[PDB]
Scaffold this active site. Structure first.
Site, PDB file in Angstrom:
ATOM      1  N   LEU A  14      79.686  31.605  47.458  1.00  0.00           N
ATOM      2  CA  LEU A  14      79.433  32.654  48.440  1.00  0.00           C
ATOM      3  C   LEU A  14      79.232  33.981  47.732  1.00  0.00           C
ATOM      4  O   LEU A  14      78.362  34.771  48.089  1.00  0.00           O
ATOM      5  CB  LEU A  14      80.596  32.745  49.420  1.00  0.00           C
ATOM      6  CG  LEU A  14      80.779  31.499  50.289  1.00  0.00           C
ATOM      7  CD1 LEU A  14      82.058  31.617  51.099  1.00  0.00           C
ATOM      8  CD2 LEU A  14      79.566  31.283  51.196  1.00  0.00           C
ATOM      9  N   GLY A  15      80.042  34.224  46.720  1.00  0.00           N
ATOM     10  CA  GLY A  15      79.836  35.382  45.894  1.00  0.00           C
ATOM     11  C   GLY A  15      80.867  35.528  44.812  1.00  0.00           C
ATOM     12  O   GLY A  15      81.559  34.566  44.432  1.00  0.00           O
ATOM     13  N   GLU A  16      80.927  36.754  44.305  1.00  0.00           N
ATOM     14  CA  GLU A  16      81.890  37.157  43.312  1.00  0.00           C
ATOM     15  C   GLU A  16      82.948  38.002  44.016  1.00  0.00           C
ATOM     16  O   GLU A  16      82.651  38.743  44.962  1.00  0.00           O
ATOM     17  CB  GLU A  16      81.195  37.954  42.199  1.00  0.00           C
ATOM     18  N   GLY A  17      84.190  37.847  43.578  1.00  0.00           N
ATOM     19  CA  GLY A  17      85.255  38.765  43.945  1.00  0.00           C
ATOM     20  C   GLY A  17      85.610  39.587  42.725  1.00  0.00           C
ATOM     21  O   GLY A  17      85.116  39.319  41.624  1.00  0.00           O
ATOM     22  N   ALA A  18      86.459  40.592  42.919  1.00  0.00           N
ATOM     23  CA  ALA A  18      86.981  41.391  41.804  1.00  0.00           C
ATOM     24  C   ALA A  18      87.552  40.508  40.687  1.00  0.00           C
ATOM     25  O   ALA A  18      87.261  40.726  39.503  1.00  0.00           O
ATOM     26  CB  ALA A  18      88.049  42.376  42.305  1.00  0.00           C
ATOM     27  N   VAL A  22      83.948  33.092  44.701  1.00  0.00           N
ATOM     28  CA  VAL A  22      84.349  32.601  46.011  1.00  0.00           C
ATOM     29  C   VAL A  22      83.397  31.489  46.433  1.00  0.00           C
ATOM     30  O   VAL A  22      82.173  31.648  46.364  1.00  0.00           O
ATOM     31  CB  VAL A  22      84.333  33.728  47.059  1.00  0.00           C
ATOM     32  CG1 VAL A  22      84.787  33.199  48.413  1.00  0.00           C
ATOM     33  CG2 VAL A  22      85.213  34.890  46.601  1.00  0.00           C
ATOM     34  N   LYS A  37      88.659  31.398  46.831  1.00  0.00           N
ATOM     35  CA  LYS A  37      88.456  32.262  45.680  1.00  0.00           C
ATOM     36  C   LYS A  37      89.167  31.638  44.487  1.00  0.00           C
ATOM     37  O   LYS A  37      90.364  31.362  44.540  1.00  0.00           O
ATOM     38  CB  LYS A  37      89.003  33.655  45.950  1.00  0.00           C
ATOM     39  CG  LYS A  37      88.624  34.718  44.920  1.00  0.00           C
ATOM     40  CD  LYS A  37      89.450  35.973  45.202  1.00  0.00           C
ATOM     41  CE  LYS A  37      88.695  37.247  44.962  1.00  0.00           C
ATOM     42  NZ  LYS A  37      89.342  38.363  45.696  1.00  0.00           N
ATOM     43  N   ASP A 129      87.746  49.882  46.951  1.00  0.00           N
ATOM     44  CA  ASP A 129      86.418  49.389  46.596  1.00  0.00           C
ATOM     45  C   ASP A 129      85.598  49.056  47.838  1.00  0.00           C
ATOM     46  O   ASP A 129      84.949  48.016  47.919  1.00  0.00           O
ATOM     47  CB  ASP A 129      86.523  48.176  45.661  1.00  0.00           C
ATOM     48  CG  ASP A 129      85.274  47.983  44.810  1.00  0.00           C
ATOM     49  OD1 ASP A 129      84.412  48.889  44.789  1.00  0.00           O
ATOM     50  OD2 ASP A 129      85.164  46.924  44.156  1.00  0.00           O
TER      51      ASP A 129
HETATM   52  O1  LIG Z   1      83.684  34.139  53.833  1.00  0.00           O
HETATM   53  C1  LIG Z   1      84.217  34.723  52.908  1.00  0.00           C
HETATM   54  N1  LIG Z   1      85.501  34.982  52.522  1.00  0.00           N
HETATM   55  N2  LIG Z   1      85.579  35.760  51.401  1.00  0.00           N
HETATM   56  C2  LIG Z   1      84.403  36.017  51.008  1.00  0.00           C
HETATM   57  C3  LIG Z   1      84.070  36.751  49.953  1.00  0.00           C
HETATM   58  C4  LIG Z   1      82.673  36.945  49.693  1.00  0.00           C
HETATM   59  C5  LIG Z   1      82.343  37.807  48.532  1.00  0.00           C
HETATM   60  O2  LIG Z   1      81.909  39.052  49.067  1.00  0.00           O
HETATM   61  C6  LIG Z   1      81.718  36.415  50.476  1.00  0.00           C
HETATM   62  C7  LIG Z   1      80.316  36.589  50.286  1.00  0.00           C
HETATM   63  C8  LIG Z   1      79.440  36.031  51.116  1.00  0.00           C
HETATM   64  C9  LIG Z   1      79.851  35.229  52.237  1.00  0.00           C
HETATM   65  C10 LIG Z   1      78.956  34.632  53.148  1.00  0.00           C
HETATM   66  C11 LIG Z   1      77.611  34.627  52.882  1.00  0.00           C
HETATM   67  C12 LIG Z   1      76.940  34.020  53.906  1.00  0.00           C
HETATM   68  C13 LIG Z   1      77.858  33.626  54.848  1.00  0.00           C
HETATM   69  N3  LIG Z   1      79.128  34.014  54.366  1.00  0.00           N
HETATM   70  C14 LIG Z   1      81.151  35.016  52.500  1.00  0.00           C
HETATM   71  C15 LIG Z   1      82.181  35.605  51.619  1.00  0.00           C
HETATM   72  N4  LIG Z   1      83.444  35.452  51.811  1.00  0.00           N
END
Ligand SMILES: O=c1[nH]nc2cc(CO)c3ccc(-c4ccc[nH]4)cc3n12
Length: 268
Positions: A14-18, A22, A37, A129
């Site tokens: 989904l992405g990067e955390g600090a 994730v 995460k 942040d």
């Molecule tokens: O669902 C979550 N819980 N924690 C996070 C942390 C991040 C990083 O920014 C995060 C980043 C993206 C998405 C997402 C993208 C598309 C649908 N959902 C969910 C995220 N995400």
């Protein structure tokens, strides 16, 4: 996490955390989705203490505009944090580059951002942040403040302390972080919220950093709102930004007064 991954599909990143990446985890039987995460504690000697603190802060939180924390566990050198899957994604992706989003959408998100920040500040927590990458959306596009890896306590019961750590994301950081050895927590979060509002309304960050040498910041101090991104922003929300993006944190608008702002309360 072998038993877990037998029952849960780690579908995608989904992405990067600090402190780590994730992943979207989906239970094969129930199809429940959770965000996992994954933190490699070997990446820094102080990572165990740092992730322990993120976990600790997460356990304090319960609010409709804050990402839910379900739990955590360690396996070997890896820490796993289990968080709400916010299926609306990052606020970042609702911002069309150089355009932003419709003003009513920006206003609504900003109200929700304020609700989350008021809550955090009320319990003595500063996020440090705030940016569109750390503001997620649920399935009904409700904003959720995400990632407390850089968060800290600035008020112990009813006793504030000053902060001194230069952290956050440079285009979002308040000028006092680059000017004062110590500073109040809350106005720093107010400032980053103003930068988020700017990005939502114009799809463009106004400066690399709010430092004396950054020309774009000098242009703002000199009221050159006939330049980008400001010339794309209507005078009403711009009037709020004029009150938020004030260099002296003691003169900067507080959230109670943001709630009195004309644009904040404007029917769109
Ligand atoms: O669902 C979550 N819980 N924690 C996070 C942390 C991040 C990083 O920014 C995060 C980043 C993206 C998405 C997402 C993208 C598309 C649908 N959902 C969910 C995220 N995400």
């Amino acid at each position: 996490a072998v038993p877990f991954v037998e029952d849960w599909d780690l579908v995608q990143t989904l992405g990067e955390g600090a402190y780590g990446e994730v992943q979207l985890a989906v239970n094969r039987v129930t199809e429940e989705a959770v965000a996992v995460k994954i933190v490699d504690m070997k990446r820094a000697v102080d990572c165990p203490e740092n992730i322990k603190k993120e976990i600790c802060i997460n356990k304090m939180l319960n609010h409709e505009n804050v990402v839910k924390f379900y739990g955590h566990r360690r396996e070997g050198n890896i820490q796993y944090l289990f968080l709400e899957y916010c299926s609306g994604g990052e606020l970042f992706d609702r911002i069309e580059p150089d355009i932003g989003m419709p003003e009513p959408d920006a206003q609504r998100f900003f109200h929700q951002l304020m609700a989350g920040v008021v809550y955090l500040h009320g319990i003595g927590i500063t996020h440090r942040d705030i940016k569109p990458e750390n503001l997620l959306l649920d399935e009904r596009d409700n904003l959720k403040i995400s990632d407390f890896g850089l968060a800290t306590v600035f008020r112990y019961n009813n006793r504030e302390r000053l902060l001194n750590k230069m952290c956050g994301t440079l285009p979002y950081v308040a000028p006092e972080l680059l000017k004062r050895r110590e500073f109040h927590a809350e106005p720093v979060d107010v400032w980053s919220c103003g930068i988020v509002l700017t990005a939502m309304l114009a799809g463009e960050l106004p400066w690399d950093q709010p430092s004396d040498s950054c020309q774009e910041y000098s242009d703002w101090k000199e009221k050159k709102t006939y330049l980008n991104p400001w010339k794309k922003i209507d005078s009403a929300p711009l009037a709020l930004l004029h009150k938020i993006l004030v260099e002296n944190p003691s003169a900067r608008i507080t959230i109670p007064d943001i709630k009195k702002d004309r644009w904040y309360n404007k029917p769109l």
